[PDB]
C-alpha cells in the first residue's frame, strides 16, 4: 500500500498502545455493578471523550511487507501474495502444500 | 431475441448504440431463429508499441438454438471495428442458416 497508509496505520496503532491500559481500567469501571450510576456514566463519558484512534476497532491489520489490507492471515502476519512466495521458497517453517 | 450492448473501458454513446442496433436488426431480418446477442465494445490497449491499429475491439457473442457463435474485430477506430464485427457475424449467420437448411435434403 501507499507509504502514507502504512504510516497512518503506525500512528493509529501508537495511540492504541498508549491508551491500552486506561481503556482496560475504564471498561472495568463502567462494567462494575458495584460502582455508582453517576460514576459509571461519567467513566463512559470519559471513554467517549477519549481520542478517536485510541480504539482498537479503527485498526486494520495489513501485510508486514506490502501493507496489503486484504488477504491477511493472522498466523503468518503476511498477505496472501507474499505468503505464497515465502511458502514456495520454503522460508515459512512447517508450511507445505496440502493434498488429502 | 435479446440484444445487450455493453462497453468495457469505453463510454458507449447513442451513436454506437444505433450503429450496433441497425446491423443487428439487419442480420435478424434474414435469420429469425436468433435467441440472444451480446455485443461488448472495448478499448483493450493503448497501442503503446504499435500505434493503435488494434486499439478498439468489438465482439459479438450470439446464441442460437443449439449453438453459440462468437466473433470479434480489432481496429484503430471503434466504428470500423463495429462494421467488421457485424460483417463477420452476418457471414456466420448465413453459414449456419445454410447448413441447417441443407441438412433437410
Amino acid at each position: 500500500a501507499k507509504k502514507s497508509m502504512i504510516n497512518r496505520e503506525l500512528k493509529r496503532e501508537k495511540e492504541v498502545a498508549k491508551y491500552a491500559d486506561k481503556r482496560t481500567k475504564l471498561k472495568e469501571t463502567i462494567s462494575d455493578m458495584n460502582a455508582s450510576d453517576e460514576v459509571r456514566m461519567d467513566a463512559m463519558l470519559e471513554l467517549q471523550a477519549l481520542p478517536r484512534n485510541s480504539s482498537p476497532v479503527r485498526l486494520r491489520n495489513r501485510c508486514a511487507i506490502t501493507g496489503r489490507p486484504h488477504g491477511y492471515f493472522r498466523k503468518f502476519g503476511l498477505s496472501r501474495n507474499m505468503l505464497r512466495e515465502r511458502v514456495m521458497q520454503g522460508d515459512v517453517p512447517g508450511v507445505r502444500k496440502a493434498s488429502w | 431475441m435479446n440484444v445487450t450492448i455493453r462497453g468495457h473501458h469505453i463510454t458507449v454513446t447513442e451513436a454506437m448504440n444505433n450503429a450496433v442496433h441497425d446491423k443487428l436488426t439487419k442480420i435478424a431480418r434474414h435469420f429469425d431463429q436468433i435467441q440472444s446477442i451480446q455485443v461488448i465494445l472495448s478499448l483493450d490497449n493503448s497501442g503503446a508499441s504499435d500505434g493503435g491499429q488494434k486499439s478498439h475491439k468489438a465482439e459479438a457473442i450470439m446464441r442460437v438454438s443449439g449453438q453459440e457463435m462468437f466473433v470479434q474485430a480489432l481496429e484503430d477506430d471503434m466504428y470500423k471495428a463495429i462494421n467488421e464485427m457485424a460483417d463477420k457475424l452476418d457471414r456466420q449467420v448465413s453459414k449456419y442458416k445454410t447448413r441447417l437448411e441443407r441438412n433437410k435434403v
Binding site: 456514566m41 463512559m44 463519558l45 467517549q48 471523550a49 | -
Partner: protein
C-alpha cells in the same frame, strides 16, 4: 439500536453547544457535523444545521423528534 443500559449517545461537542444554547434560548442554528448524536428532550425547540455530507441542512427540533438520531432529518443521497 442501542442497549438501554448504556443510555443515549450524545456527542460531547454538540452536547456542550446545545447546553450553552439552552441557557440563552437563542434561535441561530447550531451548525454541527455530528449526525449520529441522540436527540434529547432538552434540545426540543431550537435549530441545528446537520451536515448532510455536502452542505448543512437546518433541522428545527420539534416535539416528535426525540427518539431519533440527528442524521435521520438530513438526507444524504439526492435522487430526483
Amino acid at each position: 439500536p442501542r442497549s438501554l443500559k448504556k443510555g443515549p449517545f450524545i456527542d460531547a461537542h454538540l452536547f456542550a453547544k446545545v447546553e450553552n444554547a439552552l441557557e440563552t434560548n437563542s434561535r441561530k442554528p447550531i451548525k454541527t457535523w455530528s449526525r449520529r448524536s441522540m436527540i434529547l428532550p432538552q434540545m426540543v425547540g431550537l435549530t441545528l444545521s446537520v451536515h448532510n455530507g455536502r452542505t448543512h441542512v437546518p433541522v428545527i427540533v420539534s416535539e416528535q423528534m426525540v427518539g431519533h438520531k440527528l442524521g435521520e432529518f438530513a438526507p444524504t443521497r439526492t435522487y430526483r
